[PDB]
Amino acid sequence: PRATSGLLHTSTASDKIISGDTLRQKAVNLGDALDGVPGIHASQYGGGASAPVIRGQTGRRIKVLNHHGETGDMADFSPDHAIMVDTALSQQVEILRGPVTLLYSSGNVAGLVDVADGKIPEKMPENGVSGELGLRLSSGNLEKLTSGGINIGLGKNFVLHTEGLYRKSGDYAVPRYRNLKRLPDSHADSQTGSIGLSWVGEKGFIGVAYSDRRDQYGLPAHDCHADIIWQKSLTEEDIDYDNPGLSCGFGRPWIDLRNKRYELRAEWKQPFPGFEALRVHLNRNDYRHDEKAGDAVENFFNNQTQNARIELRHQPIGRLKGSWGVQYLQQKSSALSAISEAVKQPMLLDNKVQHYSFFGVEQANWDNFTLEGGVRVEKQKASIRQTARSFALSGNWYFTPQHKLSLTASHQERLPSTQELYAHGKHVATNTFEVGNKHLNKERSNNIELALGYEGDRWQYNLALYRNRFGNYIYAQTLNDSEMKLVRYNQSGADFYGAEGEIYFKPTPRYRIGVSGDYVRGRLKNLPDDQNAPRVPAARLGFHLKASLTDRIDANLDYYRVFAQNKLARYETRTPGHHMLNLGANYRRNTRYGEWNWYVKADNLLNQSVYAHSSFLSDTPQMGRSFTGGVNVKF
Numbered sequence: 001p002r003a004t005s006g007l008l009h010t011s012t013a014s015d016k017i018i019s020g021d022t023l024r025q026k027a028v029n030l031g032d033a034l035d036g037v038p039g040i041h042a043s044q045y046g047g048g049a050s051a052p053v054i055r056g057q058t059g060r061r062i063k064v065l066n067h068h069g070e071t072g073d074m075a076d077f078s079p080d081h082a083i084m085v086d087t088a089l090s091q092q093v094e095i096l097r098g099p100v101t102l103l104y105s106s107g108n109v110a111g112l113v114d115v116a117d118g119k120i121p122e123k124m125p126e127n128g129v130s131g132e133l134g135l136r137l138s139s140g141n142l143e144k145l146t147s148g149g150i151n152i153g154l155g156k157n158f159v160l161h162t163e164g165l166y167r168k169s170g171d172y173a174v175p176r177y178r179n180l181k182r183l184p185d186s187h188a189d190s191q192t193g194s195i196g197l198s199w200v201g202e203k204g205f206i207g208v209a210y211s212d213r214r215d216q217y218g219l220p221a222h223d224c225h226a227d228i229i230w231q232k233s234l235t236e237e238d239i240d241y242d243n244p245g246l247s248c249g250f251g252r253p254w255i256d257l258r259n260k261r262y263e264l265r266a267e268w269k270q271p272f273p274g275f276e277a278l279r280v281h282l283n284r285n286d287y288r289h290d291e292k293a294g295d296a297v298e299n300f301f302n303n304q305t306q307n308a309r310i311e312l313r314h315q316p317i318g319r320l321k322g323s324w325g326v327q328y329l330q331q332k333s334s335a336l337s338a339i340s341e342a343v344k345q346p347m348l349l350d351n352k353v354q355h356y357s358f359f360g361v362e363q364a365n366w367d368n369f370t371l372e373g374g375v376r377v378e379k380q381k382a383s384i385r386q387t388a389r390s391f392a393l394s395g396n397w398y399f400t401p402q403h404k405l406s407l408t409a410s411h412q413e414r415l416p417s418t419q420e421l422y423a424h425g426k427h428v429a430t431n432t433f434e435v436g437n438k439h440l441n442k443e444r445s446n447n448i449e450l451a452l453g454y455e456g457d458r459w460q461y462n463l464a465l466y467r468n469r470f471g472n473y474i475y476a477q478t479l480n481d482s483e484m485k486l487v488r489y490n491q492s493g494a495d496f497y498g499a500e501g502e503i504y505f506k507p508t509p510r511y512r513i514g515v516s517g518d519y520v521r522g523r524l525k526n527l528p529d530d531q532n533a534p535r536v537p538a539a540r541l542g543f544h545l546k547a548s549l550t551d552r553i554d555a556n557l558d559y560y561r562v563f564a565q566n567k568l569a570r571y572e573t574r575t576p577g578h579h580m581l582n583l584g585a586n587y588r589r590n591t592r593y594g595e596w597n598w599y600v601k602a603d604n605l606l607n608q609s610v611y612a613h614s615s616f617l618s619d620t621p622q623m624g625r626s627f628t629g630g631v632n633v634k635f
């Protein structure tokens with residue numbers, strides 16, 4: 001029961017490790033799967049994509065990690081783009097805060113979400129072989145989900161791994177929504193495949209893996225353009241482009257996406273003198289997606305990623321431990337239209353971004369108190385020159401482990417993305433024109449958080465209180481007057497604070513009852529007044545029940561009270577306001593050749609009109625009542 005993302009273990013009390021067997025019974029998308037963990041919401045976008053929203057932050061203010069590596073996707077661009085991780089094929093998903101975030105990115109203020117996978121075995125399987133098989137169906141979805149993974153000892157110290165998943169799902173049923181049985185364009189198909197090969201220790205393991213993922217899914221709530229769009233708008237010619245928006249007023253939207261991945265991992269256990277561990281990670285990621293209407297492409301998306309990170313763990317110099325590393329990340333990306341680059345300027349013109357990053361964490365241990373500090377300094381070059389310095393310092397006081405009090409502080413700098421300073425074009429799915437800013441200054445943030453945790457047979461609880469102070473908070477500022485939005489990229493200050501927590505009391509070791517909840521406030525302060533921050537979540541209180549009876553069978557009930565959101569940003573609207581009731585049960589079973597984990601799930605029994613203010617489809621109801629039956633065969 002540990003975490004893997006940091007070569008050196010810095011553990012704060014508000015760290016959460018979700019089990020992989022459990023994820024097999026969860027939604028396919030990352031954001032839907034993590035929703036329900038206190039402090040984490042979702043930005044759904046039909047059955048296709050959903051991003052986690054963590055402490056009101058999302059995208060570039062958090063970090064999704066594909067087994068310590070850059071996923072290489074383009075989900076940071078907009079929540080309609082799927083995140084390239086397979087949580088249903090994952091070993092574990094760890095949600096981490098602290099100085100560790102500095103190992104992977106700059107500007108990560110809310111949480112690091114690392115998805116660890118079986119791609120490259122790291123260990124020799126028993127009996128020479130191991131793997132699992134999974135199958136499930138879901139009502140009103142209409143989800144079919146099959147999955148498998150395999151590990152084979154190709155000899156004495158050699159292991160091959162394969163794994164894959166195929167999913168088909170329809171437009172989802174909606175309660176009371178218009179006169180519709182199902183919400184149009186919310187269907188989703190996905191396949192993933194991996195082949196791996198890895199060594200064994202001592203000292204460690206080395207290995208490579210090839211992956212392939214094709215996604216095909218609709219764009220819910222959704223011909224003339226080649227001129228007027230450009231050129232051009234700085235400044236006020238939105239006057240002249242939504243005049244011919246009602247001229248053509250008076251295809252079928254979907255995304256076809258392909259992701260190809262080549263990576264290498266290695267990590268052995270006593271590299272040479274003075275060091276306890278050495279860890280490498282090489283990655284190449286081919287990402288593409290066409291945003292289409294029928295068979296025609298409206299936007300071409302591309303993101304080539306190459307990523308390298310080397311981390312070594314130094315000798316404990318007398319109870320102070322540390323891991324220092326270097327990372328190289330180059331990312332070639334573009335976002336084009338059917339229109340040539342010879343007539344119009346692309347939404348995102350073809351660009352070359354390079355990240356040179358030096359990082360590390362150091363922890364000192366004075367018995368029942370740990371102190372870990374962290375740093376990151378990355379330089380960027382941007383062919384078509386700044387530096388981000390981020391630091392974090394954190395203390396943990398164990399009165400009696402486990403009785404945890406964490407105090408964590410950090411200053412993080414995020415360098416602006418090329419999208420943010422150079423965007424200039426209609427993104428169809430979002431029906432928004434995007435404009436960049438030639439002069440943004442880095443996102444600087446000063447963050448403080450205190451977490452408290454106890455888990456002691458009778459009582460179990462987890463609490464966290466946080467504030468995030470931005471001297472600079474870069475945001476997509478909606479602009480001057482169901483047409484098409486226009487956003488400019490802007491700067492101000494911001495003040496985010498909130499709380500999240502869960503507490504469980506078990507009367508017997510047999511039964512467990514619990515209450516959970518979260519709340520977050522987001523404000524824009526000091527504008528070039530004092531308005532709310534965009535797409536902030538809503539408060540949520542949770543009631544939880546879970547009980548085994550017995551040895552194999554495990555029923556469970558989850559009731560969430562999602563309150564409305566009336567603290568809204570510049571052009572936002574109110575969002576109710578729903579009651580989520582979820583039922584669940586599980587079958588544990590031991591036959592020959594495998595453990596057989598049957599499962600049955602019932603979500604949204606009250607059949608409520610569910611809206612999420614934190615999503616781009618805030619006035620679009622999400623899935624009504626749905627039944628799920630599934631099987632897993634571990635072996």
Ligand SMILES: CCCCCCCCOCCOCCOCCOCCO
Pocket residue numbers: 146147148164165166191192193212213214258
């Ligand atoms: C036990 C059920 C497992 C089913 C696994 C499905 C098989 C995995 O599919 C992987 C291939 O997915 C399609 C890849 O296509 C990529 C397109 O690249 C061609 C471009 O020239």
Ligand SMILES: CCCCCCCCOCCOCCOCCOCCO
Pocket residue numbers: 369393394395396397405406407408409
């Ligand atoms: C820190 C909570 C556990 C009990 C602390 C008392 C023991 C020593 O703590 C004093 C200094 O460290 C406290 C935590 O440090 C936070 C780092 O903030 C640095 C901001 O510049």
Ligand SMILES: [Zn+2]
Pocket residue numbers: 078080081291427429430
């Ligand atoms: Zn898009």
